[PDB]
């Protein structure tokens, strides 16, 4: 896998 | 003629059950009046206690919906209390969901939308009540919004409801033609109540004792009803002028 | 570290301002004293999320109660808190102290600990992540104490907790509930540390 | 007339005609008598046959060891209400280790009958019941009517020509109330009572139905050769 | 027309004829009264002795709600029982959430909203009872009377049933002759008298008197039935007044 | 790295522009600043899909609420709706948001955690770079900041995250919400990480790749 | 209760007819005429718009002719609103079949299911039936070019040429007179227009009062094209056949 | 208790008429006149503000409603029925389109969804049809400007220009004479004000007339800057002052 | 339920399926037919979890037989395979998934072409010249990659399958008690009586 | 037991001057076993191209799903869906299955028929959008593709040049991944023509 | 993680 700042 | 028994259209495009719900409005034979000040909104209603056995403190058609919103009802007390409990529930739920006090006009719209459903759904009858919502809104300032069994609602500079509504309406109309403004140019709410009572006396042609009237006042961040003694003080001021 | 103390004129609520994630202080100026009614307030310990959700619901119930039945008792507020904490004990980690002022009943303090039980006490102190202390200087507390004495008593008690503990810290916030109204007090570290 | 279509409609004089029509089913039903002393409570029932080849419709239903009723009107409705009473008697035993009070039995029947007189689609019950029992406050006799009205009585009768037996019990009140620790004599008074509601037909061995409950007597029903003694 | 055949239908007048028809059932019922006193309320009811065969004292019509509220009604007795059952659920759910026993005004609206709900749909029948109820709460003594429409008000004295006009007249005299207030023990005796006077409108069958009361001083704020010596003292007082 | 800074006549929120799959930078220039409403903006950290979805859903419901009430939406409404939604899902929706905006009440700055806790602050930081950002905010924040001072402080706090946090990088996005003015969204406000010229061009001689088959694709009706 | 106000929409007459179905068909008989004609090399759909106004936007309008998929269209006669409910259902059923089998839905299967929905409203639910008759024009690889009609009863039948709505009696006699089995699409176009031109309640048949569509194999090699005619394309075909 | 009305209150009469739809249209006929005109570079929708009382504030009651930034609606008939339809229309624009495609629906498709809600009130159990006709004016990138009428039946038709309610027959005749395919937006507003003066009897000014346009994008009404693709709403409600300015040169 | 093979030749599809049914350390049966006729020109072989295999096979058989009666038409092998895949693709996110792997061999009478489809328990569909499920593929795929010619006849295809079965008997640890071989061509489905 | 790396395979998309390119390998495996060398991972709905890597059953299921949704879109809207709008639909549809997700890495490629602007986008399995000017990568050799693309890619390449760049990016990435290869397809997409080329690569 | 005196 997921996109994750 | 079963088109007169439920909320379906008559051949001439009318809803008789809605029209008859309006006639139920005047069953109590009580007249209400609402006006706006600079800082306040005042609502006055006739108080009639015919039975001597009644506890007069419990005989009221003015309800405290929220802490800023007040609501006077013209119609039978069972339907009045039905509308009151629902409005109280709706105002509380609004504050929980959206994190700010429900505005007077938004509650009015919500109750009007509920009233509209009763005119379109057959199993539910319309409530035989006209709801007059008053507050000092934090955005719009002094506010009067009135709902009826048709699901109609609108804002008012001032308004009147009941059997002798037309007489009170024209009395207020004539004042606003003269004053040339949308409100009662008065600093204190005490003098706005004195105006409301004075113009009801002139319109109906009847005098009032402390027990013949019921008064609700909306200020910034609270709506409250006056006691018999609060009204009596107010009636003395009118008489001494 | 949170506590509520009943005194002559009403009741004082006090707490720290520190919110922790692991050893990181997420908020060093947290307001742990929450209004559920004009003169009914609560101290929140345990999960920040859980205590906020509960406090928001209790405030809704008391607002609705006030509309229908007028001003509610502190006991009523405590009952609503317990109901939410007891029925949802499996999914909740909230320790709450309820403090309120009635003109009839004066200052009342109720504690809802992790169990979801309710206890009415003259005063309550919870430290180290919702650990209520019995005793806690019972000789140091007397009934019908003065407002200044109560402020001094809570200020000292919380100061000692902050000193020994790392969970507690920042400023000391207090709320005074009396017939007069609501007063908010704040004490900065430089004042309370030299105690 | 216009106001008897359903149970959800009042008449202009404030009557519920569907309930009044249900009450009429009871008057058509065969006579049954109830009476009690301080020690015992008795049910006497005149059973009705379709013809000489048929059996005689059973009128008396056991609800617990200490309680049962006799019926007059729609038998299937008596089965529904008696089954409900059995469950409420049973609930009381299992949950509270407590024999259900005859008064509470009455209150529960009343409230069940009432719901069927206020809701559209449903109908009122078409049966009257005489409930007898012996609980912690001694002997009891109840009269149930499907209007929901339940009444505690020393004696009564329901069904066709019930007025005859009801008049007798009203006269005999002072005599039969004091028949304490004597079952047979209290039954004899019940059999002499139901005899005042007979026309042409008399009490035979397979016609008469008796039930009794008391201090040291579980609710037992007597039929056939067992009621020959009382003819 | 046909506006009276279905519940929840407005007539051209703006009336619900089915509710007005339910009132006729109430007017047909036995007399029941309520008297508000200094520190509580008194309830009394007329029980018609249809037959010698009725067990005296063992057909109780007055019902308790929670421990502090009394309820009496005239009309369809089963409809009254249905309403009290609902009242007990409402009082239980209030006490469960808010701890405090339900205030009388709060309780009054709970019955009010429920009865009013039975005038909103044609699938239901209005209640065929007027209910006189009340008790003692934190704010003192409260007496209410609730009608098939859902309409209710606070009362100093209340009456409903066949002998209501007689009872109302006798209640109005008490209010006038006792402006500073009536005591609990007095109200019990007066309640007995008014039922005996109201029995003149129902004098074919003889009757059995039944009284209950809630008083902060006499019953400690709880609902109790008037029995034994105090009941016989009230009957004797009423017997002396008719003669 | 996302920050909120309150100033005299409004609130300013800033964010970095890095999106990651494990240790890989998936997007060198992604937008973490969301418009909930014209004058209510959101900075999102945590699960990228969750922050976008939760911001769009509340934004949609706020727009409908605004039409119904005929009023400009309030930040507390967005805050209340977000926290109740996030609480319901018990932290399974991994959205950590900084909510700032101007409404008729005034200017507001809030933070929301995935479990549904909210705080109020004059300066807030969230995400992996929160500690680097907060160090700058704690060092340089003062009461009665001007707009120019608030933008500089916010961008400096993001820079701290970009340089010192491996999770944060690329450019700085700023949104300025001032009372009585249109919210101004400064996309790529700073671009301090520009790829240097490549030493060589990897453009291939045409025909370098071996082809088995060719065909024309029909995309028309 | 509510029993008093129930029309009982799903009962038999003493003669064994369905009241609401019969009255729905009476409704449809007042609707603009729709004609389908099936040729050896395509299908024509022609429909008459209900008394057009001069200020009605003709070019961006859809009243009579709707697309179900790339191979199936319908001509509507009755309540447009009712038709659109059923059309969206049919469009979904077609895509459900394509998703399941990776094959375009055979015409009859789509017709049967849409007809079975109408049937349901006449046997249960206590609701009014759909006041709609459809002409289905479609192509599949099994039966080739097919014309069907369905009506509120849920009954459907196959046709070489058919009309629904107003003046079907007159229209069916004219089609039965001039139709033959070895007919071409261009011939079927001329027949459809000539039939409407004689049955129409209007003074003269013009482009602005018509919707027109053809399903041909006019595209290159074994593929079907659906042509929903533009206003200017109707104007041209109306001059070419010599009606204006 | 419970909704026992699970059967249709709208049925076919022996003549094939749907009574309740016919009667709904009669209610629309009694309604106050509203109209719509489509120009080359915009669309105008207008109606009279029939004030129930002079004490009432006619500003609070909005007969012309924004549905999306590029779509507006006006009505003739029962106001309350319109108000709940606007609420349902705004919601369905989000739930069944914007939350799926991330853009507002085109005019024809939102109209289609409103039509569907009104068709359901025609067939569903225990409900009467909506007693309103809607005029929905809108713009979308691929269809440009468009004007649609929606009737109680659920039927909708696209119009170059039309009118509904009290004086619709006369109003439609007036529009037929004045309308051409070369009309600029200002010309269509002028014609709209001329057309509406015929049907209005009492006072005719910016306080008794409600008028909105679908025209050019309004950056000033967007509420934010920084996204070049977001250029602002095409729907604009004309002010009391803006209407009075165009009544002088009439 | 171990060995299921499939070879698509010029004019037919050949399915080979192991005859052994084993539970524990006992071979319960040595004559088991791990195939169902879906339609006159479509055959499905299956292998996986006990019970699930036959239950799934018979369920598919019933649904295709129902379609055949309703439409008086034989669904194409492509259509049957697409239906079967969708049923398995539903199964994998069910409460209890069908653990069944299938080969679908069919003759398409419209195209006059044999077709072999390989679908695993996840609903992973692929069209191949030959295929297998389980550990059989590990030996047979490389063998078929060598000796398979696309224009082979049924007799050539059977000899190629014998080579596959002989390799499996030599190198596979378990005894699968030989294979039942079925040919699907334009004339329908027939079983090779001796193998 | 990691859904995304059972079947294996890769997709890469790139923008050029008035053109986009999308490419994929043809391998479908069951872990170590190669099953099919004809498993295309690129589908098109009108002029919008969708590549999908990950669990093959979900690749097939999502293709069937987006065909369904775009077919209904075209019937109602009376026009083919655009890349920008289709991207939002993929995002919506994936996040609908947030707590039971499709194990896929979809990639959108196409040219807006109105503006003529080249468009590419990528998604995670729960539908977060990665919009990029340069390139998008997906699959078991995503790390390898990121390396190739970041070094080989330059802006505003002509179709004939862009073909060479994306081809070399895919081929050299697939050769360093065990679960990718077994053939490759490259789509070169211009405003009103689309060429599809099969690449010769090592079959191991 | 979650926040927690
Ligand atoms: Cl109130
Ligand atoms: Cl609403
Ligand atoms: Cl907190
Ligand atoms: Mg109705
Ligand atoms: Mg490789």
UniProtKB/Swiss-Prot annotation, chain D:
InterPro entries: Ntn_hydrolases_N, Proteasome_alpha, Proteasome_alpha-type, Proteasome_asu_N, Proteasome_sua/b
GO BP field: proteasomal ubiquitin-independent protein catabolic process; proteasome-mediated ubiquitin-dependent protein catabolic process
Location in or out of the cell: Cytoplasm; Nucleus
Entry keyword annotation includes Cell membrane: no
Chain positions found as Phosphoserine: 11
Top-level taxon in the UniProt lineage: Eukaryota
A single GO cellular-component term on record: proteasome complex
Sites of the Glycyl lysine isopeptide (Lys-Gly) (interchain with G-Cter in ubiquitin) crosslink: 188
Short name of one Pfam family: Proteasome_A_N
Keywords recorded for this protein, A-Z: Cytoplasm, Isopeptide bond, Nucleus, Phosphoprotein, Proteasome, Ubl conjugation
Note: Present with 7210 molecules/cell in log phase SD medium.
Description of how the protein assembles with itself and partners: The 26S proteasome consists of a 20S proteasome core and two 19S regulatory subunits. The 20S proteasome core is composed of 28 subunits that are arranged in four stacked rings, resulting in a barrel-shaped structure. The two end rings are each formed by seven alpha subunits, and the two central rings are each formed by seven beta subunits. The catalytic chamber with the active sites is on the inside of the barrel.
Protein family according to the UniProt entry: Belongs to the peptidase T1A family.
Entry protein name: Proteasome subunit alpha type-6
Provenance organism: Saccharomyces cerevisiae (strain ATCC 204508 / S288c) (Baker's yeast)
Gene this chain is encoded by: PRE5
Swiss-Prot record, chain F:
UniProt GO cellular component terms: cytosol; nucleus; proteasome complex; proteasome core complex, beta-subunit complex; proteasome storage granule
EC number(s) given by UniProt: 3.4.25.1
Highest rank taxon of the organism: Eukaryota
GO biological process, one term: proteasome-mediated ubiquitin-dependent protein catabolic process
Major location (coarse): cytoplasm
Record's keyword terms, sorted: Cytoplasm, Hydrolase, Nucleus, Protease, Proteasome, Threonine protease, Zymogen
GO molecular function: endopeptidase activity; threonine-type endopeptidase activity
Keyword presence, Hydrolase: yes
Compartments reported by the entry: Cytoplasm; Nucleus
Catalyzed reactions: Cleavage of peptide bonds with very broad specificity
Keyword field contains Mitochondrion: no
Protein family per UniProt: Belongs to the peptidase T1B family.
Assembly and interaction partners: The 26S proteasome consists of a 20S proteasome core and two 19S regulatory subunits. The 20S proteasome core is composed of 28 subunits that are arranged in four stacked rings, resulting in a barrel-shaped structure. The two end rings are each formed by seven alpha subunits, and the two central rings are each formed by seven beta subunits. The catalytic chamber with the active sites is on the inside of the barrel.
Miscellaneous information on this protein: Present with 11400 molecules/cell in log phase SD medium.
The protein, known as: Proteasome subunit beta type-2
Taxonomic lineage of the native organism: Eukaryota, Fungi, Dikarya, Ascomycota, Saccharomycotina
From Swiss-Prot, chain H:
Domain of life of the source: Eukaryota
Listed GO CC annotations: nucleus; proteasome complex; proteasome core complex, alpha-subunit complex; proteasome storage granule
Entry's Gene Ontology BP terms: proteasomal ubiquitin-independent protein catabolic process; proteasome-mediated ubiquitin-dependent protein catabolic process
PROSITE patterns reported for this sequence: PROTEASOME_ALPHA_1, PROTEASOME_ALPHA_2
InterPro entries, sorted: Ntn_hydrolases_N (IPR029055), Proteasome_alpha (IPR050115), Proteasome_alpha-type (IPR023332), Proteasome_asu_N (IPR000426), Proteasome_sua/b (IPR001353)
Subcellular location: Cytoplasm; Nucleus
Keywords: Cytoplasm, Isopeptide bond, Nucleus, Proteasome, Ubl conjugation
Family matches, as Pfam families: Proteasome (PF00227), Proteasome_A_N (PF10584)
Cross-link annotation Glycyl lysine isopeptide (Lys-Gly) (interchain with G-Cter in ubiquitin), location: 108
Quaternary context: The 26S proteasome consists of a 20S proteasome core and two 19S regulatory subunits. The 20S proteasome core is composed of 28 subunits that are arranged in four stacked rings, resulting in a barrel-shaped structure. The two end rings are each formed by seven alpha subunits, and the two central rings are each formed by seven beta subunits. The catalytic chamber with the active sites is on the inside of the barrel.
Similarity field: Belongs to the peptidase T1A family.
Note from the entry: Present with 7060 molecules/cell in log phase SD medium.
Annotated protein name in UniProt: Proteasome subunit alpha type-2
Swiss-Prot record, chain J:
Highest taxon of the lineage: Eukaryota
Crosslinked residue numbers (Glycyl lysine isopeptide (Lys-Gly) (interchain with G-Cter in ubiquitin)): 69
Chain segments annotated as coiled-coil in the UniProt record: none
UniProt-listed GO biological process terms: proteasomal ubiquitin-independent protein catabolic process; proteasome-mediated ubiquitin-dependent protein catabolic process
Subcellular location: Cytoplasm; Nucleus
GO annotation, cellular component aspect: cytosol; nucleus; proteasome complex; proteasome core complex, beta-subunit complex
Main location: cytoplasm
Functional note: Non-catalytic component of the proteasome which degrades poly-ubiquitinated proteins in the cytoplasm and in the nucleus. It is essential for the regulated turnover of proteins and for the removal of misfolded proteins. The proteasome is a multicatalytic proteinase complex that is characterized by its ability to cleave peptides with Arg, Phe, Tyr, Leu, and Glu adjacent to the leaving group at neutral or slightly basic pH. It has an ATP-dependent proteolytic activity. This subunit may participate in the trypsin-like activity of the enzyme complex.
Subunit note: The 26S proteasome consists of a 20S proteasome core and two 19S regulatory subunits. The 20S proteasome core is composed of 28 subunits that are arranged in four stacked rings, resulting in a barrel-shaped structure. The two end rings are each formed by seven alpha subunits, and the two central rings are each formed by seven beta subunits. The catalytic chamber with the active sites is on the inside of the barrel.
Protein encoded by which gene: PUP3
